A paper describes a structure:
Here, we have structurally and functionally characterized Anf3 from A. vinelandii and identified it as a flavocytochrome. The protein is a dimer and homologous to flavin-binding domains of the pyridoxamine 5′-phosphate oxidase family. Anf3 is a terminal oxygen oxidoreductase with ferredoxin or flavodoxin as the probable physiological electron donor. The terminal oxidase activity of the protein suggests an oxygen scavenging function to protect the iron-only nitrogenase.
Anf3 was overexpressed in Escherichia coli, aerobically purified, and crystallized, and the structure determined to atomic resolution. The asymmetric unit contained a dimer, the subunits are in similar conformations with a Cα RMSD6 of 0.2 Å. Each monomer core is a split-barrel flavin-binding domain that binds an FAD and also a b-type heme. Two loops from residues 96–107 and 172 to the C terminus leave the core, interact with the other monomer, and loop back. The dimer is tightly intertwined, and the cofactors interact with both monomers. The heme iron is ligated by a proximal histidine, His70, and an axial water molecule. Two conserved residues, Arg21 and Lys170 hydrogen-bond the heme propionates, stabilizing the heme–protein complex and controlling heme poise. The heme porphyrin ring is 3.4 Å from the isoalloxazine ring of the FAD at the closest point, consistent with a π-stacking interaction. At the entrance to the active site there is a tyrosine (Tyr22) that is hydrogen-bonded to a water molecule that forms part of a chain of two water molecules hydrogen-bonded to the heme axial water. This network is a candidate for a proton relay, necessary for rapid delivery of protons to the substrate oxygen when it is reduced.
Numbering used by the authors:
A (entry chain B), B (entry chain A): 10 to 223
The structure:
Amino acid sequence: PEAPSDRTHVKRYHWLARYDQETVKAILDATPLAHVGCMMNGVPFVTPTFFWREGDRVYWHGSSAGRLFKALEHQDICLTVSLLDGLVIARSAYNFNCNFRSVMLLGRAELISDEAVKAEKLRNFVDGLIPGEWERLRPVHAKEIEATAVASLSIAEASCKVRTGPPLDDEEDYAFPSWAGVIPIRYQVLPPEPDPRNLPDVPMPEDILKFRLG
Amino acid sequence: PEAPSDRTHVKRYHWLARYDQETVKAILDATPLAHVGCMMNGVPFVTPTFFWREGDRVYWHGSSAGRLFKALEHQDICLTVSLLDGLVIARSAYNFNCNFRSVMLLGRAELISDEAVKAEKLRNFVDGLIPGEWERLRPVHAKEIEATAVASLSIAEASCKVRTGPPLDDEEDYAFPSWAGVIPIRYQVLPPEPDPRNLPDVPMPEDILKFRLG
Ligand SMILES: Cc1cc2nc3c(=O)[nH]c(=O)nc-3n(C[C@H](O)[C@H](O)[C@H](O)COP(=O)(O)OP(=O)(O)OC[C@H]3O[C@@H](n4cnc5c(N)ncnc54)[C@H](O)[C@@H]3O)c2cc1C
Ligand SMILES: Cc1cc2nc3c(=O)[nH]c(=O)nc-3n(C[C@H](O)[C@H](O)[C@H](O)COP(=O)(O)OP(=O)(O)OC[C@H]3O[C@@H](n4cnc5c(N)ncnc54)[C@H](O)[C@@H]3O)c2cc1C
Ligand code: HEM
Ligand code: HEM
């Protein structure tokens, strides 16, 4: 598929562009960390935040009194998700690069006003990180739900760029004696570290070990 | 110190704020990956990009013809640098969290128009990733320098937020029988992978193994 809109048409390095939903979803599903762009207080602020996908929308949360959740009401935003996958070492400095996956989602986000729906989405967020976890926790209080904003944005107006594989040098540079290659980069998760305030008689759910990213 | 400006004053979770330049520099020095916010084509786009610090400014590069480099001359931007350091598992869903380091730099970026200065800064970028690397490469062409933009932004108008350590539950939840703790997260660098097209007698510089992040 071509780009979904003129404003999502990748121009630079367009050979790296992907617009298909399989790729959009695969990148969104690989990581929890987004960066949301929104005009606030005169600046295109970039807010790091967690996000989760359900079908054709992504969601994020924060304070019901938070400035982003008010500011997103009347402007189109950009939600960017990036993964750095390697440093690409070429024979010329100009052709150094990185391997990566990134997606930009554009458009008008909306807040979930229905508190029952909001709680259902927040359960999906938690259980998407750690299966079954929401049900193990101290039961949520109504005031906690009501203090939380949940925003969502369609994934439809999305552009991706992906780079994999070796360096690509100018054809005339392959006789130059310098070492080229790739340094792979990834997220690593380490074993869980228990809170020292845990009750000694409380087991660790095995599901905690299923959390992964990158 | 307090915030350097009203627009960098952390309000939410203000106890996590840091404004001291030692913390600003330590976060900036830990990672090459930034996200730059800039209003372009009616959207506060969030562009992932590499950056490097020299003293009291950060720098980034791209095409001399790139839209970001044109747009930054006439608006204040936000440059955000985030590091995800762990998933914080609490007894209540409301107090789940993450350990992290993040810095936002605000203000008016500047382009380097002097080609000789630009080339000097680009060598600092490369050798900041891999010591001694620039010298090893196929010598740079004037046209390569001239095709590149380099922008910079002062680090002075900066806010940081940092979270470390265990979960912090409501005090009344500490008798609830659920496991709390932290899943640490970090970047990992893997062994370098040579380009198959490397010349057979050209060894990998040991300095490649010095590249690190996170
Ligand atoms: C980990 C990482 C590191 C990077 N480092 C650098 C760097 O140091 N220097 C540099 O110049 N660029 C870097 N890039 C690429 C950068 O994000 C931009 O893609 C590039 O600079 C072109 O931006 P542009 O606005 O000129 O693109 P244009 O092609 O003019 O943008 C047109 C449209 O393309 C789409 N698009 C553009 N970039 C992306 C993207 N990254 N992901 C998804 N859709 C996109 C958007 O819909 C956008 O509106 C990096 C990307 C990643 C993920
Ligand atoms: C890895 C990571 C994941 C996160 N996940 C979430 C999430 O899922 N939900 C959530 O609500 N928040 C999340 N945060 C925090 C988020 O980035 C914001 O700090 C928070 O949402 C409050 O934003 P605000 O605009 O309401 O802050 P305000 O306090 O109103 O912002 C005022 C000023 O504080 C400064 N500031 C705000 N946030 C930051 C920051 N992160 N770093 C540096 N300076 C800052 C800026 O100068 C800003 O202009 C995450 C942060 C990181 C780094
Ligand atoms: C795995 C799940 C979750 C993670 C990783 C997470 C992470 C975060 C982070 C990082 C912040 C920002 C705090 C700061 O400013 O430093 C935040 C804020 C917030 N979260 Fe969550 N959260 C999770 C689940 C939830 C749930 C399920 C709820 C509601 C039941 C919730 C309610 C809130 C609220 C209300 C805020 C704003 C706090 C304030 O500034 O007053 N969170 N969360
Ligand atoms: C370690 C060093 C470097 C890294 C990691 C790096 C990375 C990148 C990345 C990721 C892009 C974006 C390409 C895309 O759109 O997918 C880029 C673009 C660019 N880089 Fe670099 N780069 C490095 C060094 C340099 C140097 C030293 C020069 C100049 C000598 C240079 C010149 C350019 C130019 C001109 C572009 C724009 C290309 C275009 O779209 O026309 N880069 N770089």
